[PDB]
Amino acid sequence: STGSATTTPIDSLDDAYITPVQIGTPAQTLNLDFDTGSSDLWVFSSETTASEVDGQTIYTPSKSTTAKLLSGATWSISYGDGSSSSGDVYTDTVSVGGLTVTGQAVESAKKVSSSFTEDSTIDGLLGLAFSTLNTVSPTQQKTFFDNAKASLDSPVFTADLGYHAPGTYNFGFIDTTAYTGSITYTAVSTKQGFWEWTSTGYAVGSGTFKSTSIDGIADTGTTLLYLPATVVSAYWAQVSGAKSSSSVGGYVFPCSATLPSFTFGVGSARIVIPGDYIDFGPISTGSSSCFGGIQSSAGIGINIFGDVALKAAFVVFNGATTPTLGFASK
């Protein structure tokens, strides 16, 4: 089997991407944030504290003939951005782009943090990291991809995120029309539960490539590119007037600037992030100070190849017995 679904930016800045997901019978379609940095499929629901729901579409398990309470199971997650959610668990039929999993753990939120409430466009998350990170207790649950894997034509999914445009998540096949040149594959460590890999270096604009190992995670659920302070300083040093602002919470730059590209290495291959992808617009409405899309990972504890990086590539998440990651230009 295979699946193919379009993923759409939630706003004009590509702050996140939502993908429609069918849950239950009859189908209830929710727009979920596909997140290769976590491993829970959780949704706003009929059980979510009413004051914490603000415009989201909810899953109502009582209206699904295939929903079953997973007795005794609870979940609770905190994300790297400080947001969180928790609740109980149902199993139900879940389909993505034509690919159907029966008995998928659907984690129903009883509580969500304000960040989730305040974002009307995201109805929940669909985790695509390794199932070892799943938070369901006392019986850990498998991700959608893990459940689908054996049935897929090939045990892979691909992320093809657009810049200020829709893109595609495919399951079970590699669309050879969706990228240019060849796909370069690189080793993955699953030790921390993430799609963790090592970039071979970077360049700023038309500058020379610096060969240096940068361990980080491929994370579709993180907006920006978080890299070591040395790398980030080298980038912003090429933008007149750019500075790290403790009050804003990162590098800002004059909105009048033209940003240089940023290149990262995948083995001997190179992925070029155009300068425009690194512009996240005014820090507040009407400001002439703009927020940068490349930020320091210092104090995160890990480097994160988030959407800024991934949307410059066609990315293969290869879930074979020994997982790997593939990157192609597009």
Curated annotation (Swiss-Prot):
Disulfide-bonded cysteine pairs: these are C255-C290
Any single biological process term in GO: proteolysis
Catalytic reaction equation(s):
Hydrolysis of proteins with specificity similar to that of pepsin A, prefers hydrophobic residues at P1 and P1', but does not cleave 14-Ala-|-Leu-15 in the B chain of insulin or Z-Glu-Tyr. Clots milk
Top enzyme class of this protein?
A: hydrolase
UniProt name for this protein: Endothiapepsin
Species of origin: Cryphonectria parasitica
What family is this? Answer: Belongs to the peptidase A1 family.
Domain Peptidase A1 residues, every copy: 17-328
Assigned EC number: 3.4.23.22
Can you provide one Gene Ontology molecular function annotated for this UniProt record? aspartic-type endopeptidase activity
List the active site: D35, S199
Q: Which UniProt keywords apply?
A: Aspartyl protease, Disulfide bond, Hydrolase, Protease, Signal, Zymogen
Tell me where on the tree of life, at the top rank, the source sits. Eukaryota
